[PDB]
Design a protein around this ligand. Structure first.
Ligand code: NA
Lengths: 230, 217
């Protein structure tokens, strides 16, 4: 079957460079233009650039955001197309997909839909390294209490890499708990929150502790979440 | 996106017909550039769905149809099936960008449970974080269906876009969805305003919660 396989992902510092090879199989690589597309974590698709067949000079065309920084090239004898990324910026962080441009003929011209996609490879541009989280309480108050139910939680900030797990009262409190996925800040560090809803009457009588584990930094944090009388 | 505009979400029950619009410009669809559609199933790479405005690749069933008229394109799904839950992206060439442009993407939900409006809780910076010279507002959204919201922030009634981070919705234990959004501020920014608000839009309706820096400090 037709197949594309990217390699070469990884973590690289801003201002450095990385090459991604993409190997094609199951079709005649040289018969097709090839196109790169990227998808930053949580975001939509964004075209990177494409390269024509060698018989036409293998000319290339890029999105404005990577012009003068990224270079696409191809080697038809090895069925490989390369994405050379120079001058990397944090906002280049994305999954990079290698794609094949179709040959289907329309009314007087060829279409250019991307009809085969690789699985994609992650490129992270960041100066972050292993870092344990800071844990802050999200104290319950009148502003988080509705109809006799109070929400409280804990904010787990600026850690690397994923993941952290959160439990409440050592696993004894599970009803109403939700731990959210993390957000990636531009600094390259992650943050998340965990929330639980409890009866507002229990607040003076029950203790609530969120247990944060970040195994990459060998850190555990048990944060007491005290209610605010406002 | 800028030059191609899609609705962030669309939904319907199994068997229904839904449409996804792709509103273009005279620098792309209106100038005659063809429209392409890509389907991205959750956790997968995109696949070509429609090429050259209305053509289906082999392997794409005929409940998918594409049309174009003027500066607009549209993807119809006639007879929604469960496996069609996916993000859909339209794509066209744009001469003001001189590149291949994508719409922002539409999440299609195939409804399997009753719709449910979101609950919203907004947390101010904790004193502990403030004492560490940082400030994060935390807006938590829960118990909603389908799993698509938009979150906007305000300071003193005025929009604020810098410093915002939002997660894509994910399932809670009760099978509804939750989402979170964060506003990062300096302690001085926080203290300098009278109010901060998060506004959560779900199915064209909006829930807004407000905190005041002068309270709970
Ligand atoms: Na070509």
């Amino acid at each position: 079957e037709v197949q594309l396989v990217e390699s070469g992902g990884g973590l690289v510092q801003p201002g450095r460079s990385l090459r991604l090879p993409c190997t094609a199989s199951g079709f005649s690589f040289g018969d097709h233009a090839m196109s790169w597309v990227r998808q930053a974590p949580g975001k939509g698709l964004e075209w990177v650039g494409f390269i024509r067949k060698t018989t036409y000079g293998a000319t290339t065309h890029y999105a404005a955001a990577v012009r003068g920084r990224f270079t696409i090239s191809r080697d038809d004898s090895k069925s490989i197309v390369y994405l050379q990324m120079n001058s990397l910026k944090t906002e280049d962080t994305a999954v990079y997909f290698c794609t094949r441009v179709q040959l289907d003929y329309g009314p007087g011209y060829q279409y250019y839909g991307m009809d085969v996609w690789g699985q994609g490879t992650t490129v992270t541009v960041s100066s972050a390294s292993t870092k344990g989280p800071s844990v802050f309480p999200l104290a319950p108050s009148s502003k988080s209490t509705s109809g006799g139910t109070a929400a409280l939680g804990c904010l787990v900030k600026d850690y690397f890499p994923e993941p952290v797990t959160v439990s409440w009262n050592s696993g004894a409190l599970t009803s109403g708990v939700h731990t959210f996925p993390a957000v990636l800040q531009s600094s390259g560090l992650y943050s998340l929150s965990s929330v639980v809803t409890v009866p507002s009457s229990s607040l003076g009588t029950q203790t609530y502790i969120c247990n944060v584990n970040h195994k990459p930094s060998n850190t555990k944090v048990d944060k007491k979440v005290e209610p605010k009388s406002c | 996106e800028s030059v191609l505009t899609q609705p962030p979400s669309v939904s319907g029950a199994p068997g229904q017909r839904v449409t996804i619009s792709c509103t273009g410009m005279n620098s792309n669809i209106g100038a005659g550039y063809d429209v392409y559609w890509y389907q991205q199933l959750p956790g997968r790479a995109p696949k070509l769905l429609i090429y050259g405005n209305s053509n289906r690749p082999s392997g794409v069933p005929d409940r998918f149809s594409g049309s174009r008229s003027g500066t607009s394109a549209s993807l119809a799904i006639t007879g929604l099936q469960a496996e069609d839950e996916a993000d859909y992206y339209c794509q066209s060439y744009d001469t003001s960008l001189n590149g291949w442009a994508f719409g922002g993407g539409t999440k299609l939900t195939v409804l399997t449970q009753p719709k449910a409006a979101p609950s919203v809780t907004l947390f101010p910076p904790s004193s502990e974080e403030l004492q560490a010279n940082k400030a994060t507002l935390v807006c938590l959204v829960s118990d909603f269906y389908p799993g698509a919201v938009t979150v906007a922030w305000k300071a003193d009634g005025s929009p604020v876009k810098v410093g915002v981070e939002t997660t894509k919705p994910s399932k809670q234990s009760n099978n509804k969805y939750a989402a979170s959004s964060y506003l990062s501020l300096t302690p001085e920014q926080w203290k300098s305003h009278r109010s901060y608000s998060c506004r959560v839009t779900h199915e064209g309706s909006t829930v807004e919660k407000t905190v005041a820096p002068a309270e709970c400090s």
